[PDB]
Design a protein around this ligand. Structure first.
Ligand SMILES: O[C@@H]1[C@@H](O)[C@H](O[C@@H]2CO[C@@H](O[C@@H]3CO[C@@H](O[C@@H]4CO[C@@H](O)[C@H](O)[C@H]4O)[C@H](O)[C@H]3O)[C@H](O)[C@H]2O)OC[C@H]1O
Ligand SMILES: O[C@@H]1[C@@H](O)[C@H](O[C@@H]2CO[C@@H](O)[C@H](O)[C@H]2O)OC[C@H]1O
Ligand SMILES: [Zn+2]
Length: 184
């Protein structure tokens, strides 16, 4: 089951995150900076199948409903974005991957002098799978993460050997909204 609660805010606006029972959490946010809230696992796995149900997905502005995680060796942040608000994240286009009923575009981005799990000022690459259209929410959904890892790997996108957290997240920037998600 899930063993990790992520609740990070850069301190802008309100992020009211509720660590609920089991794999359940909610977030109600207002006029935020950057934040990431979610439930999953202390130690991520390239093999894991993440199940979730987003009972509420109501961003007003930039929010992502996304698998979010990190590796070290090297330091990489990765995403599998299923839904969003006013902004679909993109970057350097690498290809596509089909998984769990949808097609995702694959992208890489680079962050400079940015907060990471290794410091408040670091340089790192982000790997993305971004669904081509918003995934319906409210039903039980799967993300077969092995499919994304294999697709990324085949496009020369190597994850680090040391796996950090891995969560089904609400991430926001400069936005308001409400979400309710259960992860298992
Ligand atoms: O205000 C309302 C919110 O409280 C509500 O919260 C949602 C409650 O429904 C959630 O979806 C549940 C999650 O659990 C699923 O069962 C799993 C089935 O697979 C098993 O292996 C696993 O052990 C079970 O836990 C269940 O089928 C599903 O209905 C949802 O995630 C919450 O966000 O949302 C609606 C608001 O109006
Ligand atoms: O690019 C942004 C990242 O810089 C941000 O990283 C967060 C840094 O603080 C850590 O405690 C968090 O766990 C980590 O997610 O993530 C959001 C992204 O937009
Ligand atoms: Zn490919």
């Amino acid at each position: 089951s899930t063993d990790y609660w992520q609740n990070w805010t850069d301190g802008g606006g309100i992020v009211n995150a509720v660590n609920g029972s089991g794999g359940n959490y909610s977030v109600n946010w207002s006029n935020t900076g950057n934040f990431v809230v979610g439930k999953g696992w202390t130690t991520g796995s390239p093999f894991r199948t993440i199940n979730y149900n987003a009972g509420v997905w109501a961003p007003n502005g930039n929010g992502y409903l996304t698998l979010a995680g990190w590796t070290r060796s090297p330091l990489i942040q990765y995403y599998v974005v299923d839904s969003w608000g006013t902004y679909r994240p993109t970057g350097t286009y690498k290809g596509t991957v089909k998984s769990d009923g949808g097609t995702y575009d694959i992208y890489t981005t680079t962050r400079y002098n940015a907060p990471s799990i290794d410091g408040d000022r670091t340089t790192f690459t982000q790997y993305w799978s971004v669904r081509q259209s918003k995934r319906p929410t409210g039903s039980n959904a799967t993300i077969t993460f092995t499919n994304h890892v294999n697709a990324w790997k085949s496009h020369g996108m190597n994850l680090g050997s040391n796996w950090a957290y891995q969560v089904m997240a609400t991430e926001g920037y400069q936005s308001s909204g409400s979400s309710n998600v259960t992860v298992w």
